């Protein structure tokens with residue numbers, strides 16, 4: 100995703116609201132996860148946001164700057180999808196680019212015809228085994244935590 | 248607090264509200280409460296910027312036509328930061344049914360309006376129970392440590 | 397209630413909020429409170445439609461960056477209509493200053509979702525004092541009579 | 546003004562919210578009043594909404610219908626402008642047009658340089674003599690009402 | 694159509710984005726073409742934008758100025774509608790009016806019930822036979838550009 | 842640049858309005874052109890839209906489908922930028938993709954210090970020589986159309 104930041108995206112200091120960026124982040128996560136969950140022509144479904152991991156906002160973004168939002172599916176469990184989203188600001192006058200934040204989201208597919216039906220998530224192929232292993236450990240961390 | 252009716256543009260094709268919609272509302276509540284507090288002792292004029300979102304689980308869906316209720320509370324202050332806990336509740340105004348959608352914790356930092364990116368001191372808060380100050384102090388130390396990776 | 401920070405698109409070239417912006421927020425509060433009430437006894441599912449806005453004066457300006465606080469109360473019910481009083485207060489979160497922006501009164505009529513333009517019976521509200529019902533009944537009669545010129 | 550009504554303009558029933566129409570009405574009033582209060586090259590100003598008269602909503606408007614919003618300055622006092630706004634719905638499939646609402650609004654011009662400075666309003670030309678007298682009577686009745 | 698230009702319509706300097714005006718232009722074209730294609734109570738339809746002809750932006754528009762959009766159906770073929778749209782900027786503080794844009798659009802009526810069914814366009818009334826001839830030439834010109 | 846199509850982007854049939862797409866195309870054109878015109882760190886400028894030409898809408902896009910907007914600078918004259926934009930629709934439930942739109946936009950860099958000052962456009966490198974010649978022919982034809 101690429102969008103010019105507008106006055107209504109920003110506070111009175113002209114700096115973009117956290118909420119504006121969070122919204123864009125989730126939009127990217129929703130597209131990528133829904134596409135994936137339908138990618139093997141299983142039951143028609145839409146991915147629902149189940150969890151947002153801790154995220155830190157490192158640098159401001161200003162009106163007139165371009166928000167760049169990119170997403171990657173980094174893990175899949177039996178019924179869930181982990182998405183990592185990166186947000187970068189670009190000033191197209193000066194050329195300066197800054198990392199706004201990195202967020203991690205967990206999605207769960209729900210049947211279009213039965214909203215209470217959690218679907219199985221198709222596997223992804225990992226470029227690196229360490230990526231599957233790291234993803235598994237993150238999956239475990241949140242599973243264990245939610246087990247109270 | 249804050250409430251608003253969920254509209255078509257707030258929801259997916261299933262009729263369920265996008266997480267991003269609720270996240271935006273949560274941050275709107277945090278911004279108001281933290282900005283007010285950071286100017287509450289008439290210090291240098293400032294606006295609270297969102298520094299951190301803690302992990303948060305979405306427990307129940309919300310649908311078009313349901314009312315999102317968003318409430319915020321300042322639960323800790325450090326020298327230069329504000330911790331805010333936000334609760335989101337969905338209300339179906341046809342059936343009456345209310346459900347807890349989400350609980351989220353946020354951290355804000357006040358930045359001067361006049362001095363670009365100047366971090367300001369946060370006025371102290373008073374704790375209903377002193378157990379709460381200690382718990383908040385522990386939460387503060389935990390994020391301070393986690394960020395210094 | 398409802399609260400929202402005023403944004404540049406809410407305001408004219410001078411930074412002052414448009415009447416239309418506030419009118420919209422007023423009606424949003426009215427729509428929620430009246431719809432909830434009209435479904436509160438689980439009658440035929442319905443949505444409250446705005447029938448009337450009483451005369452209303454805008455007492456003080458609001459500015460970009462101030463927080464609009466909107467609060468509503470059902471003050472009367474007739475057989476098929478709901479009277480709602482709405483208060484709008486501005487809050488400057490930098491200075492702490494609060495001002496009454498506007499008081500408005502609205503009338504809603506519940507319409508069936510299933511049966512188009514079917515007007516439904518409104519559940520009675522509880523009054524703390526008989527005087528409240530009498531005062532509302534007088535306002536109801538006034539507008540009812542006027543709608544015959 | 547003429548605008549197609551969209552889903553976000555309407556409730557779950559597909560009927561346009563009163564609030565949406567109210568916002569459009571005020572937009573029409575703001576334009577006509579601001580243009581008028583600058584029409585004699587006085588101090589630059591913007592008209593602010595002072596009063597909305599009682600108004601009844603007669604017929605619903607639906608998603609996909611076209612809202613027609615028309616305004617006319619019907620009276621001016623020394624420092625205020627009376628505006629009548631009509632809203633009509635047009636169904637462009639069926640051809641059917643309906644009167645949604647008629648509203649009267651009062652605006653007061655405020656200096657751009659000084660928000661607290663109320664400016665004098667230029668006179669309007671009345672097509673009929675009786676119209677000025679009618680507007681004058683309404684002005685005095687509301688001015689006398691505002692006592693508290 | 695008339696609308697005041699707002700901060701979100703414009704860049705950091707306060708000049709209106711072309712996209713904002715393009716959106717307004719298309720809205721006007723969609724209304725006028727849809728009404729016409731349903732004017733004889735044929736199968737219920739909505740006119741879809743098929744083409745924008747070479748449109749030129751002649752002068753900037755600013756926040757606070759009023760955009761005036763006017764549309765006219767200038768030619769009809771068997772299954773399409775040519776619409777010419779004019780955009781005028783009005784500064785309501787100074788009184789200045791400027792021609793912002795002239796655009797020519799082509800619409801095709803599609804059945805509402807029957808997803809992608811192209812319908813016949815009712816013929817338009819011409820004031821002079823010369824107008825039909827000129828329209829025909831423009832019709833043939835766009836046909837040629839499209840066949841390359 | 843991706844985004845999901847929402848109810849307010851579309852008509853009563855669920856099909857996206859031409860205006861919605863035109864706005865997205867222009868946003869992409871504005872970003873790429875402004876970035877390019879500041880790429881050699883000349884006088885700070887923003888590129889203003891001057892022309893939209895010969896843009897055709899080939900297939901409908903629906904609510905819930907994802908719009909993919911891709912921009913490319915295809916010609917530069919001394920003071921203007923030609924941008925070609927393609928819009929592709931993607932159904933993330935079915936996987937189906939369709940070419941929605943092909944557009945051509947001309948931008949002109951205007952100094953931020955002097956809003957009437959048309960700046961020089963840095964040259965671009967052409968992947969195939971033939972593209973420059975084709976671009977020049979298009980450029981000459983439109984520049985002469987603004988003469989004859």
Ligand SMILES: CC(C)(COP(=O)(O)OP(=O)(O)OC[C@H]1O[C@@H](n2cnc3c(N)ncnc32)[C@H](O)[C@@H]1OP(=O)(O)O)[C@@H](O)C(=O)NCCC(=O)NCCS
Pocket residue numbers: 114115116117120154155156157158159160199296297298299325326327328354356358364366390391394
């Ligand atoms: C918030 C910000 C100003 C902090 O910058 P910094 O270099 O860390 O500033 P300092 O080192 O002086 O620290 C100031 C305070 O901020 C706190 N802080 C900084 N980052 C934090 C984070 N991610 N989470 C919680 N607190 C944080 C520090 O703990 C410190 O408070 P303390 O002294 O009471 O412990 C900076 O990270 C920033 O501008 N981020 C972007 C904010 C923003 O624009 N958000 C929306 C983006 S769309």
Ligand SMILES: CC(C)(COP(=O)(O)OP(=O)(O)OC[C@H]1O[C@@H](n2cnc3c(N)ncnc32)[C@H](O)[C@@H]1OP(=O)(O)O)[C@@H](O)C(=O)NCCC(=O)NCCS
Pocket residue numbers: 147148149150176177178179205207217241242245263264265266269304305306307308309348
């Ligand atoms: C996501 C949701 C459907 C899960 O419900 P549930 O009763 O826990 O479902 P299950 O017990 O069958 O678990 C299904 C999967 O979801 C995962 N899950 C559930 N809650 C989760 C959370 N908070 N974070 C990460 N994963 C979660 C489970 O781990 C399981 O996947 P796995 O078997 O691969 O490990 C439910 O919490 C929900 O509807 N949440 C709201 C979603 C939404 O609408 N979001 C937007 C709100 S605005």
Ligand SMILES: CC(C)(COP(=O)(O)OP(=O)(O)OC[C@H]1O[C@@H](n2cnc3c(N)ncnc32)[C@H](O)[C@@H]1OP(=O)(O)O)[C@@H](O)C(=O)NCCC(=O)NCCS
Pocket residue numbers: 412413414415418453454455456457458497593594595596622623624625651653663687688
């Ligand atoms: C409108 C406003 C400037 C009037 O303030 P005031 O103290 O009464 O000012 P003045 O006494 O000098 O009156 C100026 C004119 O306004 C008129 N007026 C004041 N309140 C009015 C009302 N509510 N309805 C109609 N006219 C009104 C007066 O009659 C006078 O006109 P006149 O001399 O021709 O009779 C003030 O109430 C205000 O700023 N309101 C908020 C306007 C606004 O921002 N609207 C949008 C809110 S979101």
Ligand SMILES: CC(C)(COP(=O)(O)OP(=O)(O)OC[C@H]1O[C@@H](n2cnc3c(N)ncnc32)[C@H](O)[C@@H]1OP(=O)(O)O)[C@@H](O)C(=O)NCCC(=O)NCCS
Pocket residue numbers: 445446447448474475476477503505515539540543560561562563566601602603604605606645
């Ligand atoms: C409100 C509406 C349904 C009433 O229609 P109606 O033909 O008068 O219906 P009824 O005669 O059966 O009257 C039903 C109730 O509505 C009330 N009513 C009707 N118009 C009213 C008005 N303008 N103000 C207050 N009450 C009104 C009647 O008093 C009656 O209540 P009661 O029996 O307790 O006295 C109708 O005027 C309408 O559909 N208006 C448009 C509503 C709308 O869509 N609003 C937004 C427009 S953008």
Ligand SMILES: CC(C)(COP(=O)(O)OP(=O)(O)OC[C@H]1O[C@@H](n2cnc3c(N)ncnc32)[C@H](O)[C@@H]1OP(=O)(O)O)[C@@H](O)C(=O)NCCC(=O)NCCS
Pocket residue numbers: 708709710711714748749750751752753754889890891892918919920921947949959983984
């Ligand atoms: C585009 C604009 C700057 C050109 O004005 P002008 O008086 O013709 O300026 P010039 O004669 O000096 O022409 C400068 C360049 O613009 C080009 N140009 C002007 N109009 C053009 C058009 N409609 N299409 C393509 N190129 C155009 C010229 O070809 C020239 O480039 P070149 O020297 O490489 O050939 C002017 O018409 C303008 O400000 N338009 C409005 C732009 C805007 O605000 N867009 C959004 C409106 S909502």
Ligand SMILES: CC(C)(COP(=O)(O)OP(=O)(O)OC[C@H]1O[C@@H](n2cnc3c(N)ncnc32)[C@H](O)[C@@H]1OP(=O)(O)O)[C@@H](O)C(=O)NCCC(=O)NCCS
Pocket residue numbers: 741742743744770771772773799801811835839856857858859862896897898899900901902941
């Ligand atoms: C408009 C559309 C239905 C035409 O499809 P088609 O296969 O060419 O249909 P037909 O061959 O039956 O042609 C019907 C008419 O459309 C016209 N037409 C099609 N594309 C056109 C274009 N690019 N410019 C002008 N006219 C066009 C033809 O000239 C023909 O008119 P005629 O018979 O009077 O000469 C198709 O291109 C489409 O669905 N485009 C997208 C429309 C849309 O959804 N717009 C918004 C996109 S966000």
